[PDB]
From Swiss-Prot, chain A:
This is Kinetochore-associated protein 1. Interacts with ZW10; the interaction is required for stable association with the kinetochore. Component of the RZZ complex composed of KNTC1/ROD, ZW10 and ZWILCH; in the complex interacts directly with ZWILCH. The chain holds residues 194 to 305 of 2209 of the full protein. It comes from the Eukaryota. Essential component of the mitotic checkpoint, which prevents cells from prematurely exiting mitosis. Required for the assembly of the dynein-dynactin and MAD1-MAD2 complexes onto kinetochores. Its function related to the spindle assembly machinery is proposed to depend on its association in the mitotic RZZ complex. The lineage of its organism: Eukaryota, Metazoa, Chordata, Craniata, Vertebrata. High expression in testis. It is found in: Cytoplasm; Nucleus; Chromosome, Centromere, Kinetochore; Cytoplasm, Cytoskeleton, Spindle.
UniProtKB/Swiss-Prot annotation, chain B:
ZWILCH gene is deleted in a patient suffering from colorectal cancer with chromosomal instability. The modification Phosphoserine is found at S14. It is found in: Chromosome, Centromere, Kinetochore. It comes from the Eukaryota. Component of the RZZ complex composed of KNTC1/ROD, ZW10 and ZWILCH; in the complex interacts directly with KNTC1/ROD. This is Protein zwilch homolog. The gene is ZWILCH. Belongs to the ZWILCH family. The lineage of its organism: Eukaryota, Metazoa, Chordata, Craniata, Vertebrata. Essential component of the mitotic checkpoint, which prevents cells from prematurely exiting mitosis. Required for the assembly of the dynein-dynactin and MAD1-MAD2 complexes onto kinetochores. Its function related to the spindle assembly machinery is proposed to depend on its association in the mitotic RZZ complex.
Length: 112, 74
């Protein structure tokens, strides 16, 4: 089933991340265009995902890469700037504008 | 704040008010997030502060009104 982001991401979607929090499936897609962020969640009454949250391309024009460890959406913007976000409501928690991080990797001895 | 200089004898269908005033309103959710972030940053010891060289003093909470302009319902 193809779901089109042509009505929200007019310049192509750049990064996609999928998780399972709050008894849902938050699929956060970061791209450039009318809306920088699109949060798709599966509709329980239908067959497909619908948009639940939208962030305009005003402060951040888009997301290049995501990494969702747990309740922490580390968002790398189009300016190679890393930031810390809370996935529950997408509120600004932290920002890292001093470090021009082209790519960031988070590694830990994961047990649970 | 303008002077009428055209004559319109046609019938216009519109409604008008005779004493209604807009009271307190709510800020946009995107605007509210910026202020919530500013409050969070102003009271964070891990900020590279530009005007304060001391640990930040705690203050009673901030609550920004939201107009629910997003499908959050907030």
């Amino acid at each position: 089933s193809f779901i089109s982001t042509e009505n929200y991401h007019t310049l192509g979607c750049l990064s996609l991340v999928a998780g399972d929090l709050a008894s849902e499936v938050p699929v956060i897609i970061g791209g450039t265009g009318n809306c920088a962020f699109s949060k798709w969640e599966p509709d329980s009454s239908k067959k497909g995902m619908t948009v639940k949250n939208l962030i305009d391309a005003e402060i951040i024009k888009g997301a290049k890469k995501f990494q969702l460890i747990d309740n922490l959406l580390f968002v790398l913007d189009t300016d190679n700037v890393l930031s810390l976000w809370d996935i529950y409501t997408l509120t600004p928690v932290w920002n890292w504008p001093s470090l021009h991080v082209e790519e960031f990797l988070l590694t830990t001895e994961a047990d649970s | 704040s303008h002077i009428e200089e055209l004559q319109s004898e046609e019938t216009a269908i519109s409604d008008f008010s005779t004493g209604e005033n807009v009271g307190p309103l709510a800020l946009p959710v995107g605007k509210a997030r910026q202020l919530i972030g500013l409050y969070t940053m102003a009271h964070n010891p891990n900020m590279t502060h530009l005007k304060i060289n001391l640990p930040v003093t705690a203050l009673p909470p901030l609550w920004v009104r939201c107009d629910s302009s997003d499908p959050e319902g907030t």
